[PDB]
Amino acid sequence: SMQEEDTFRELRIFLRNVTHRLAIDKRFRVFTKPVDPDEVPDYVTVIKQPMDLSSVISKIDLHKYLTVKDYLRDIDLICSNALEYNPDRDPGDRLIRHRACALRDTAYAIIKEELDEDFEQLCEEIQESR
């Protein structure tokens, strides 16, 4: 219905805004774009399902997220990919992991403050009906 398509449009607007706020934070620069297969040619052999905040924006616009739960699974994916690809004790890896965990915690804190649970529940019920 028309009401429902306005619900999802509102969701998209909210998701773009959250994503942009993450994307402009200096700590999260490494997560803003896909990994360059020139600079890191083994990346695609290790990480089966790459994700980054640019790709999140594309997915928003493609209407791939009907719920914030589905968006957050992608934020989680950015974080888990980073923990997997950068598992070692060295400072580079540790820095990446610290930032990946900060990314996730920030995404969740924003959504916690700014997303009405009844709006999420409506999204979930519209999704379930399709």
Swiss-Prot record:
Stimuli inducing this protein: Up-regulated in breast, uterus, colon, ovary, and stomach tumors. Induced in breast cancer cells overexpressing NCOA3 or treated with estrogen. Down-regulated in 5-fluorouracil-resistant derivatives of the colon cancer cell line HCT 116.
Tissue: Highly expressed in estrogen receptor positive breast tumors and in osteosarcoma tumors.
Domain Bromo: 3-114
Subcellular location: Nucleus
Coiled-coil residue spans: 108-130
Subunit (UniProt): Interacts with ESR1 and NCOA3 and these interactions are enhanced by estradiol. Interacts with acetylated lysine residues on histone H1.4, H2A, H2B and H3 (in vitro).
Assigned protein family: Belongs to the AAA ATPase family.
Task performed by this protein: May be a transcriptional coactivator of the nuclear receptor ESR1 required to induce the expression of a subset of estradiol target genes, such as CCND1, MYC and E2F1. May play a role in the recruitment or occupancy of CREBBP at some ESR1 target gene promoters. May be required for histone hyperacetylation. Involved in the estrogen-induced cell proliferation and cell cycle progression of breast cancer cells.
UniProt-recorded name of the protein: ATPase family AAA domain-containing protein 2
Source organism of this protein record: Homo sapiens (Human)
